[PDB]
Design a protein around this ligand. Sequence first.
Ligand code: 40F
Ligand code: 40F
Ligand code: CL
Ligand code: CL
Ligand code: CL
Lengths: 442, 443
Amino acid sequence: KKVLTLEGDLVLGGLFPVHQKGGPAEDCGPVNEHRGIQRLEAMLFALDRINRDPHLLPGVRLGAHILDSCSKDTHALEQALDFVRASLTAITGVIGGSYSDVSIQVANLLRLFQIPQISYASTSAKLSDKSRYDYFARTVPPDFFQAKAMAEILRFFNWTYVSTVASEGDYGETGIEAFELEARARNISVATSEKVGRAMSRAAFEGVVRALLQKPSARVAVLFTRSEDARELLAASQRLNASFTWVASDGWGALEEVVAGSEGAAEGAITIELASYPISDFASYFQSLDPWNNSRNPWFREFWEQRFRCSFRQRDCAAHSLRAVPFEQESKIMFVVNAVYAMAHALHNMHRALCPNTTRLCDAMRPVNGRRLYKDFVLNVKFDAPFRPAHNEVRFDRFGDGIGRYNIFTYLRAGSGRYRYQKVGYWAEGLTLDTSLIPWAS
Amino acid sequence: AKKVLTLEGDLVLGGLFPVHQKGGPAEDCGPVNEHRGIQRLEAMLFALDRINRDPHLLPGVRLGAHILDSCSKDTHALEQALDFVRASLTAITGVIGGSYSDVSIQVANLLRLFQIPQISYASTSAKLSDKSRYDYFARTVPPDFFQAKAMAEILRFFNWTYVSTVASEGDYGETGIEAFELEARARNISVATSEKVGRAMSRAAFEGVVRALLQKPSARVAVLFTRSEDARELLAASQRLNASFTWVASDGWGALEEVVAGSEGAAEGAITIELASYPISDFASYFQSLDPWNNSRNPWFREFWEQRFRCSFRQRDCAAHSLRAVPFEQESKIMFVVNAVYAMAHALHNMHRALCPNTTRLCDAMRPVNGRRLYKDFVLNVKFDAPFRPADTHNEVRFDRFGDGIGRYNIFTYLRAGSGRYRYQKVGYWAEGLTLDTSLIPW
Ligand SMILES: N[C@@]1(C(=O)O)CC[C@H]2[C@H](C(=O)O)[C@H]21
Ligand SMILES: N[C@@]1(C(=O)O)CC[C@H]2[C@H](C(=O)O)[C@H]21
Ligand SMILES: [Cl-]
Ligand SMILES: [Cl-]
Ligand SMILES: [Cl-]
């Protein structure tokens, strides 16, 4: 498989779902544009800015070794061998992965070589356990909080009889387990609990929907699903003409790919995303990307062909521009940039203590000690989030986690007939909803 | 800790045993583990000696060992298991173990990256049957769907319809109880409460579990899918709180003495399960003849001796003891250990017969052994009479399509015998249907 490599004095590993999961034979399927390509390019954008920052590692260039997880933990683990083979390349730290199952599988390999790891999207509560994930940190909070936010949405609307659907794996199952605990504490009962396996068919999704219809009093379906599972569930529901009030986690969030083609089935859905903002300079950087000037990204030409349904062989790709089309910044881009900066700040603070007389890598950091870097620097960073709007701070808590803050969205059909996500609320140690923005709310 | 049991050979087999219990929050390794630790490790060494003398099983190919200690911890086991792959980055042809499902899964994730076949003698988690994830794993034991079905059938037989469940956190406990619950539901069995035992539970936290179970006085039956230490500590807490429960426990508790020792009263009337087996021949004699001077090959034996006879070698006079003098109860899964080692030798033998026909020695075609072909073409197709089987038995060793063993279990009850001593009695079995006889059950 191909790899993205950038030269530096210290090299940061990267892990992203550049491609979707493949079919029954192949590990890798189509290019994953939003949570794959954009997130990868956000890490490249962050590295470029750090490398030109006079106040952050002025004498230490940050390189990269970025791998594709193909949205599959076993494939991510096979790729993750490149990070450790230079110990039986030299990787100082790893940024990634996205999926909780990928981050857990990778963390269990990285800790064996004391490589620090910072995830920008893995929300599984299991990852908060430092006796098991002692080299793991994340810029995102655990789903202990997300599950409360979802139980409280149901409690506010008095939805006391609901069904649940969880993605098989750490994320979905432990997320739904936390949701169900939090719902029972607020006297919300569960009609049925469905599961979506890691290799389900389109007909098997229709089975899930039929199973949810077997309890007609439960109109509210609570999802702790991966985007693809939310997408297929919704497509199955459109096909069987089933109507549900969806309440879904960040896996769905405010992704257009989830609802595209099943807008009618999704209408009225309440979704959650981790509280974030779009990073302004990232948008001009991404929209400038060009298949002729972006050779450092080995998956960019395959992304271009898919996005613009063109062929470089057929010479019909140049007519397209990311400048000439609309740009929707993926919700967790801020978390990617914060993870790269958190690692850069940690190495900078380590450099200040270990190399006081030079801006260059002194012998004390040849090589970088993984234990010290994680325990005494990564966990202790505290800085103002870069490219933030006119206020956020990057830091890790005692479990190496981010802050439990969430945005609440609703999926609606506007007066024009066009569909959109609309921010209707917020959760941060308590629920705040603006019912005037929810079309079906009284 | 960092001791490794090494034995030279033409082909080296990796080994993995919980030679020590898990330590406290500051140490990876705790006290030496006699029954599921020392005895199983010794059973592998016993099998290797007997294979290495056998003229019909690899006559010109000596099998070596690289045996590691998991310390009953999946993170520790995996740090140790790097030894198995550091060459492929001495060469390891296949691996025997581990015991705990979480250990076996963690190691299988690593070994498959290097196409290293693995055979467990005790990990029963259904997750391990998934060949999209554990394509180099096989086992001499069945997956826990069968154990969980057997448990739901035991309840249904006695009309125990409102019950409680206790699971050790992880892929053995949680998935075992989850399977049990689906089988119990279909048999009109309800669940009062479901408790989880965390990996770092305190004496107070176990008492909290007992009180959580007491909050439902209608449910006197508690179904356990727990690791032996969790069951030991839950019984200890029940004894402390004068709590009375009808225990229905998986192989984790099984027929272990250590689980019941000191909590006999809280344990009395327990229905426990173990995988169907027999004590093997020659091993009882092999184990009892072990001394701190002849057994230098096992670096953990002196520490086992010190624990067993409650003495110290530094202070001396530990020597004036013998395993022959003390009684010997062969650990229930010793047969699975020997079967796993023999399964690998037979797969290696059959591969040798096909790829090296012109010599009894290791030819080029097996220099190195191709792990993918070893697993797919030979390990999955082994079929042989179980070594050291008892008189007038037709036990065979084989694997199904997915590398799993056959769902056959023995059912036990924990009772006070006529001599006043507390003990486990065989009162039934499950092999595609429940057979138990009420007569041997005192209640
Ligand atoms: N929070 C998730 C997880 O697996 O931990 C759910 C699905 C996938 C989300 C994302 O990449 O934005 C990440
Ligand atoms: N069957 C178990 C498992 O973890 O899969 C339960 C606890 C431990 C048992 C044993 O070593 O005898 C093994
Ligand atoms: Cl990923
Ligand atoms: Cl083990
Ligand atoms: Cl245990």
